[PDB]
Amino acid sequence: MRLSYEALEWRTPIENSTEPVSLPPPPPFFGQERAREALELAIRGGFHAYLVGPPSLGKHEALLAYLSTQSVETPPDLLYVPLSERKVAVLTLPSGQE
Amino acid sequence: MRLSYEALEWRTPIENSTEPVSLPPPPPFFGQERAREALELAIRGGFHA
Amino acid sequence: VSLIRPGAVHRAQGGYLILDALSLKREGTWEAFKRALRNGQVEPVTEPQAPAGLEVEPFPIQMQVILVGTPEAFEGLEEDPAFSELFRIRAEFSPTLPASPENCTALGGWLLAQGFQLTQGGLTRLYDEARRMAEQRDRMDARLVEIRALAEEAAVLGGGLLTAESVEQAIAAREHRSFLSEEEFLRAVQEGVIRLRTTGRAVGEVNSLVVVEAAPYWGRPARLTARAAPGRDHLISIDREAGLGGQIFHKAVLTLAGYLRSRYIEHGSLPVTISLAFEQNYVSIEGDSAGLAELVAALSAIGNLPLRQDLAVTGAVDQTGKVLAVGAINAKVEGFFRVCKALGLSGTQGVILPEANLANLTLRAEVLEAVRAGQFHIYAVETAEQALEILAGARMEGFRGLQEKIRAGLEAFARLEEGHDKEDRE
Amino acid sequence: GGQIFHKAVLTLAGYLRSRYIEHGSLPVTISLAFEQNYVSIEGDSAGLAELVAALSAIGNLPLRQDLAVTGAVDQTGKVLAVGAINAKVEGFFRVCKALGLSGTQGVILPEANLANLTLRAEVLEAVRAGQFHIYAVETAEQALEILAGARMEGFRGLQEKIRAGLEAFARLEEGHDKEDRE
Amino acid sequence: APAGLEVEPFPIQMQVILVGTPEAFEGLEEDPAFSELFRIRAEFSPTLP
């Protein structure tokens, strides 16, 4: 069938283009609700997750942005303390006490 | 088709050849505007080319 | 004790550790890391030169390690049964995003947060270019770094502001920076070195569309020709039986053979042999593109049917005759349009493409403008019969039909073959 | 023979088949060979030369030996462009000059390569003087018409001579099979 | 080096440009990381008008 221009036209029309745009930043993993929900489940449950996607997509940057806005109970101060000149163990202290 | 000399002749004719030529140096990447524009864009933007 | 250096595990305690699967497997540390995750404890790596070494207590692991990378890095590790239970959660990133006004607004906000200054038209053109980069009309490309790079080029070409003109210039420059091969091809076509019939009609030949393997984003027509000779049923694709045809191309010749057999049975077999070959050698086949092109060329050769040479033909075909979708349809259409424009549009050039690829048609501004002006004609087909009807400009059924012409050609070839065997047993 | 040369024999076979069908197949076998061994083939050059030689052998057609023939050909019969056309033309001109130009030597080259013709001063001077004749052709029919010096169509045509030769070969083959089943 | 100096990494404010035949570049273009580093391709035409 001989396609017409209207059926072939795909660029969204522009009614005004001389003004700057002011839009709020989008939520991380925008348009990718599957991965966002996977990260939400892995964060709530504490499970180990893994990110899969095509190369050069922004997975690392988006994941870092999403993890930055997260909030968790402050981790305890973990540090090595020597029981002797040969024996050293792991010490757990409340955050800020180290 | 039997080609004639005129159709086969390709050397540009010379009307005077006993005088030296004095021409200004050409711009870099002359006759290669694609590469020159690529370098211009990479230099203005600071990208690695 | 003070010489113990903190690694990734120590600094990620109580939080999230982000690792790359390909780099993790490249260093060969997967086994030790997996054992540490299994035990929940780990000790710092010690040199083999230690005389006695410190009695380091294993460090408890309270983190949530996250592996980020391409899937191909993960089929290098998913076979391990211990990897399955450690990573119960799989986060898969879609290669595309839904092309919606909300998604366009989100992309604009992301670009503004990235540091670029955009306009409404510039954002619209970025959205359109992302959709085209995803190759689908209603799905934008999810590769945000590619769009960011294009936005950077647009900012440089526009002084920082991402107006529609600046982004259009950026896209044009990106196309032109890799246009040398296509420029040489167009020069050869204009000079007559590579002769492509983009006007008039010819028998047994069609302008098949190919995408160059050296750069799988530039399309160009390839003058495929088919010649029909009486003999055994085997179909010859001369460009394959020279080391060029691939495993995917192996299925193509059998597919056309099966369709030609099952579709035309008034003798016990096909009384013809078909020789398929492109005019040039830059068409080393990897994939089922052309397809429909080879089928219509072979049918025209069988029936002595002058195919309209101004219409290029692409798209895979099955043994049922249904035309299947092919990739990089936009590249093929744009390449054929470029070739036709180089020789001058006559108002009748066009491309025969499957209706399946209609959802992948994201043609550039010039092609759509030509279609609107009537200088170019995009045709969408479902079965090979429609494509051949368009090429020959007549109906299959009825008198003066294409099917009856092909049947008469096959009958004549069978008569000549039986005359040969008559002389054989005389 | 090389991989590029491999599809050349199939190309000539396909053209010879599809172009001449008044029997169910080609009743002849064609033996293509250069007399010398310095022609280890890598590419589709010659081409048209092989096709016209095979057609002349089929039809018993005396080809003008003073005209060299080059250029690849397709199964449609269109003559394809080739590289180093200048080198081939200059080499043939050198050979003809070594034996002495008779005013009729020339080269059969595709018209597609006309944009690549950058012949040296001596060759162009010879062409201007009429001692050398560069011919540009589109299809193999034109090249063989130039070689044989007569038209394909019409009575005393080249096409009818080739058809008569094929018919005679088929008659001899059917005589052989007649003696076979006697 | 027994201990080696604690050299701070040197900041990179350069624009690297790779020059060579294409055949050298199909030895590196397959790397996905090479694509986004070198966003600008400058191709030299084998001929000039």
Ligand SMILES: *[B]([O])([O])[C]([C][C]([C])[C])[N]C(=O)[C]([C]C1=[C][C]=[C][C]=[C]1)[N]C(=O)C1=[C]N=[C][C]=N1
């Ligand atoms: B196709 O696009 O499926 C087509 C099929 C053939 C029957 C006409 N083949 C090609 O376009 C080939 C194979 C290919 C390679 C990479 C991506 C897609 C397809 N490529 C070329 O045309 C080619 C190959 N080498 C050099 C130049 N051009």
Ligand SMILES: *[B]([O])([O])[C]([C][C]([C])[C])[N]C(=O)[C]([C]C1=[C][C]=[C][C]=[C]1)[N]C(=O)C1=[C]N=[C][C]=N1
């Ligand atoms: B050709 O130029 O395509 C021709 C085709 C053949 C059917 C007559 N063959 C050659 O000229 C060959 C192959 C070749 C090599 C290098 C560049 C181009 C073509 N070469 C020779 O004639 C040759 C080979 N070895 C020694 C001497 N000459």
